[PDB]
Design a protein around this ligand. Structure first.
Ligand SMILES: *[C@@H]1O[C@H](CO)[C@@H](O[C@@H]2O[C@H](CO)[C@@H](O)[C@H](O)[C@H]2NC(C)=O)[C@H](O)[C@H]1NC(C)=O
Ligand SMILES: *[C@@H]1O[C@H](CO)[C@@H](O[C@@H]2O[C@H](CO)[C@@H](O)[C@H](O)[C@H]2NC(C)=O)[C@H](O)[C@H]1NC(C)=O
Ligand SMILES: *[C@@H]1O[C@H](CO)[C@@H](O[C@@H]2O[C@H](CO)[C@@H](O)[C@H](O)[C@H]2NC(C)=O)[C@H](O)[C@H]1NC(C)=O
Ligand SMILES: *[C@@H]1O[C@H](CO)[C@@H](O[C@@H]2O[C@H](CO)[C@@H](O)[C@H](O)[C@H]2NC(C)=O)[C@H](O)[C@H]1NC(C)=O
Ligand SMILES: N[C@@H](Cc1ccc(O)c(O)c1)C(=O)O
Lengths: 463, 469
């Protein structure tokens, strides 16, 4: 009546690699080029960003082992900060952070799948939404069927992402192998300097976007066979290789395209694909779209699990932990996730939510790392694996704070608007989490609705 | 907890009426998915596909730049071929795509026996200097076009003699210079050449024979439309600069008639817009009209050609003692050592590189806009009627940002009075449009304003931009 491990180290590495590689280096290499310094300086910036992310990884590599509980960044702060902050985190998390992520990835998939039918003219807006919704529904059905198939699907799509990136690297190196200066010698031509507002710094909060998703594996922990060594091994395998792949891809883009051409473009991948390959160029965009497909799957494979954690504590309705007796798949959680994503599809524009996405995730990470050392002080006797010192995280913590600074630079009013959602979520906590005193009619109605749902979809509780 | 137990649920959920419901719901979901797929494919099919790009060459993507006197470009005492390589950055600031150097061959007089088109005059530089200039330009992506005229220091430019020998020598010079890596050629005053059409056709055929990325420029001094069209009766890929838009401009309707008639007669091909072949803008217009024409020439369906010093409003007659055929550029207050203190800080390039209310800033903004958008690159041109003394037209390629230019050549203010119902519905102007820029300071930018009550100040131009309709 409880879900099993059904995950090995290779699956975890595939999940983390796939979720790291989203649109990423396929859609926005221009930013750091035109936001800080010169082309060559951009080659440095990515590398620096990678180190940053790597450092952060080496925190969750220990903290995750410290409290071996599923639901990363939620169950970990459930202990230090009490009950209310954890519920606030989970509520805003499910309400905004997930559906935005799934919808953006699905929309990117739809656009880069439909692009080869509208090369210069823009893709119709109606078709992209329908294709994204179809992708989300199909992936939800696949996950609800059996996790075992989804594991191989994620493995195959991570392999496809790696193959596409390797092909990009190979083509970028071959277009130099024929013999050309390729304007690599001129560097720091218009580097300038870090302005008072910030010039070189201004590129970091855009470069770090592609490095996101380095904690999704910690969401579905305790589902891994012997996580103790597998999780740190997965992190150590995943991070340096993806950082070197991104820096090599940036080099490959710079060695083939001039600065003016990059500035005068939107999709650098399409230009690189149709430039040195000509006819049958559709391979380059399609693969990119295919990549996004796998990404969506990974998100689902984490998101539902987080919900399965919440109802365990009691913060969630008791139904959102139910399990089909013959198929372990947590059906109600998956249905909830897909319904939320489809409701989030009704928007008016793009990037309207991503603006505070960095603020939200960075503040959550910062609070978690702050709570780490306070927990260690309040409980210095535990069976933790490496007994690593707090030397490394402290510096990282300060860097985290710096991000909030930039966060309150572009759209502070949007941040203030975003705060209103959690302020309205406090009454959500007060309604049912704490005020257990409810009239008999409400309890009877809740029980009737739950039993009706259980009758409709065959699910039995977890024990 | 708060729900039916496992064993009771599995005992109760086996009766008929609950498996049938689940099966019906599964069928409904799976049929709705295929319905959505069918809707998506129908949406994809029922849409216009796209419009293919016209595969532009290099000279379709920006404005050219002429240099009639190499020595006087950067002042006396430094005139040399290698001197130019220290200036391309400034040229790169203007984002030009060409550099029409003046004649640099050996020619002392109307002497023909020893006038050669293959030997660089030592007063300018050397062959190695020319190679270095070409290499530096290639690194900077600035294409170089070399002038060729048998006489450029004499009175008659074709020796007033039988043209067989000069035709043969220039034909040899074409193939000799194409080895070095020049990207085109220019010949001026072809109206003084006997049997011009055959020579131009042969030269164009020879030049296009080496590659498809070479250019040929022909310049005349005539203004008759029939005369201009006569030289194109056998060539259609030639760029012919002429004084077609000069000797007029007092009334806006006259210029509109000239442009529309030229486009209708030529059959909507690629033409070059310029007020002359070797003269600056100030040699034909008052000092209050340079901005108007500079806006005009950047938004025409063609390749604008400007002479040096036309981005800072250089005037030959504003400084006494300066020949009108070769004014000295004003890089600073000391750029003119003779009679010092006769030049202000407003006429200097360095004095205009930071003031937004100046010709150079407007020049740079217009050049940036011209070489970026597709509508200004290969868009369609449509001119519609307006009030008297006005010239209003529209540029629209396929589905990109439509541009609408309104020009008031009159000296008195008046209303817009634009008229619809004479353009395709895909090109109909909207009620409100943005304002990309205005040549008259005193207006805001980025504010979507209505077109019903638009008024124009004397000698004012507007460059409204609106998205796809
Ligand atoms: C070029 O000029 C000639 C004059 O009749 C014509 O084409 C010539 O002859 C053949 C047929 O095209 C070509 O292979 C030669 O190259 C042409 N001779 C030249 C260069 O003058 C025709 O009028 C023109 N066609 C071309 C090739 O541009
Ligand atoms: C172009 O310039 C010439 C020279 O000023 C003008 O006059 C012609 O001069 C040549 C001698 O170089 C004579 O053989 C011609 O007879 C002159 N033309 C006429 C019409 O008499 C010429 O008029 C100018 N073109 C225009 C259109 O004004
Ligand atoms: C270009 O304009 C000309 C000149 O108007 C037009 O051709 C014909 O011209 C005669 C005399 O003006 C008139 O019959 C009409 O103006 C034109 N015939 C028509 C269109 O019925 C024509 O409108 C335009 N197109 C071309 C290239 O002929
Ligand atoms: C640059 O500034 C000087 C200083 O005003 C201008 O000199 C004036 O010229 C204008 C016409 O251009 C005359 O009306 C004034 O009498 C001059 N004033 C002074 C105090 O010199 C100079 O002409 C300006 N540049 C231009 C071409 O306007
Ligand atoms: N990293 C994804 C997009 C993304 C994923 C996860 C994140 O947490 C994030 O902030 C952004 C990509 O490369 O396209």
């Amino acid at each position: 009546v409880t879900l099993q491990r059904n995950i090995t180290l290779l699956n975890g590495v595939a999940i983390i690699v796939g979720t790291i590689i989203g649109s990423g280096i396929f859609v926005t290499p221009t930013g750091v080029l035109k936001e800080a310094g010169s082309p060559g300086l951009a080659l440095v910036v990515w590398a620096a960003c990678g180190v940053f992310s790597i450092v952060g990884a080496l925190c969750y590599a220990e903290l995750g082992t410290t409290i071996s509980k599923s639901g990363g960044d939620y169950a970990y702060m459930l202990e230090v900060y009490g009950s209310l902050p954890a519920f606030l985190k989970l509520w805003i998390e499910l309400l905004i952070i997930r559906p935005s992520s799934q919808y953006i990835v699905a929309l990117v998939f739809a656009t880069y799948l439909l692009k080869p039918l509208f090369p210069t003219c823009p893709v119709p807006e109606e078709a992209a939404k329908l294709v994204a919704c179809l992708c989300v529904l199909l992936l939800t059905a696949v996950n609800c069927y059996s996790v075992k198939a989804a594991t191989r699907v994620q493995d195959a799509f991570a392999a496809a992402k790696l193959l596409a990136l390797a092909l990009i690297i190979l083509l970028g190196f071959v277009q130099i192998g024929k013999g050309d200066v390729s304007n690599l010698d001129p560097n720091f031509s218009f580097e300038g300097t870090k302005l008072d507002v910030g010039n070189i710094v201004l590129a970091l909060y855009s470069g770090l976007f592609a490095y996101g998703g380095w904690n999704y594996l910690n969401f579905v922990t305790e589902e891994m066979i012997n996580p103790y060594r597998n999780l740190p091994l997965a992190i150590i395998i995943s991070l340096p290789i993806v950082t070197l792949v991104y820096v090599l891809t940036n080099l490959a883009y710079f060695t083939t395209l001039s600065t003016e051409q990059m500035l005068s473009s939107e999709a650098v991948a399409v230009d690189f694909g149709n430039y040195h390959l000509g006819v049958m160029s559709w391979i380059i965009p399609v693969f990119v779209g295919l990549s996004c497909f796998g990404s969506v799957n990974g998100s689902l494979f984490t998101s539902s699990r987080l919900f399965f954690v919440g109802s365990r504590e009691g913060h969630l309705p008791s139904i959102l932990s139910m399990i089909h007796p013959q198929l372990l798949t947590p059906v109600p959680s998956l249905v909830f996730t897909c319904v939320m994503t489809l409701l989030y599809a009704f928007s008016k524009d793009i990037f309207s939510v991503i603006n505070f996405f960095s603020f939200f995730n960075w503040l959550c990470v910062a609070l978690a790392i702050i709570g780490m050392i306070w927990l260690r002080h309040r409980k210095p006797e535990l069976e933790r694996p490496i007994k690593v010192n707090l030397a490394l995280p402290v510096f990282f913590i300060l860097a985290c704070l710096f991000l909030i600074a930039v966060s309150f630079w572009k759209t502070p009013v949007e941040c203030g608007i975003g705060f209103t959602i959690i302020l309205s979520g406090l009454p959500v906590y007060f309604f049912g989490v704490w005020w257990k005193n409810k009239p008999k009619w409400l309890l009877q109605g809740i029980f009737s609705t739950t039993v009706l749902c259980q009758k409709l979809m065959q699910v039995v509780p977890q024990e | 907890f708060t729900g039916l137990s496992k064993e009771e649920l599995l005992k109760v959920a086996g009766s008929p009426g609950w498996v049938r419901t689940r099966w019906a719901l599964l069928l409904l979901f799976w049929l709705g998915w295929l319905g959505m797929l069918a809707g998506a494919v129908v949406i994809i099919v029922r849409a216009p596909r796209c419009r293919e790009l016209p595969a532009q060459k290099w000279w379709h993507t920006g404005a050219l730049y002429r240099i009639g006197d190499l020595q006087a470009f950067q002042g006396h005492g430094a005139g040399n071929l290698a001197g130019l390589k220290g200036r391309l950055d400034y040229l790169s600031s203007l984002k030009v795509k060409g550099l029409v150097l003046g004649p640099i061959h050996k020619n002392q007089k109307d002497d023909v026996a020893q006038t050669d088109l293959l030997q660089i005059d030592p007063n300018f530089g050397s062959k190695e200097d020319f190679d270095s200039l070409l290499q530096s330009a290639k690194k900077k992506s600035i294409r170089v076009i070399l002038d060729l005229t048998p006489n450029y220091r004499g009175e008659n430019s074709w020796f007033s003699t039988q043209v067989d020998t000069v035709a043969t020598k220039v034909k040899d010079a074409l193939e000799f210079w194409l080895q070095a890596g020049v990207d085109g050629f220019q010949v001026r005053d072809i109206e003084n050449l006997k049997d011009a059409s055959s020579f131009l056709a042969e030269w164009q055929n020879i030049t296009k024979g080496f590659s498809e990325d070479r250019l040929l420029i022909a310049g005349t001094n005539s203004s008759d439309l029939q005369q201009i069209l006569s030289l194109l009766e056998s060539n259609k890929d030639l760029l012919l600069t002429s004084s077609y838009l000069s000797d007029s401009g007092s009334t806006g309707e006259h210029t509109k008639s000239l442009v529309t008639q030229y486009l209708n007669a030529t059959g909507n091909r690629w033409c070059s817009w310029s007020l002359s072949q070797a003269r600056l803008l100030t040699s034909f217009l008052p000092a209050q009209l340079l901005r108007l024409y500079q806006l005009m020439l950047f938004t025409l369906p063609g390749t604008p050609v400007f002479s040096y010093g036309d981005e800072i409003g250089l005037d030959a007659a504003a400084l006494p003692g300066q020949p009108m055929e070769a004014p000295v550029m004003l890089w600073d207050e000391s750029s003119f050592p003779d009679i010092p203190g006769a030049v202000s800080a407003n006429m200097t390039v360095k004095g205009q590189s930071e003031d937004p209310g100046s010709l150079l800033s407007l020049f740079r903004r217009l050049s940036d806009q011209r070489s970026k958008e597709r509508s200004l690159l290969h868009g369609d041109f449509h001119a519609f009627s307006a009030g008297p003394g006005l010239f209003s037209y529209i540029r629209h390629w396929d589905q990109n940002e439509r541009f609408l230019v309104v020009l008031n050549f009159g000296d008195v203010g008046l209303s817009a009075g634009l008229q619809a119902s004479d353009l395709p519905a895909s090109a109909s102007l909207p009620a409100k449009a943005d304002l990309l820029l205005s040549t008259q300071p005193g207006r805001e930018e980025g504010s979507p304003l209505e077109l019903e009550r638009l008024k124009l100040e004397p000698h004012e131009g507007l460059l409204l931009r609106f998205p796809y309709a």
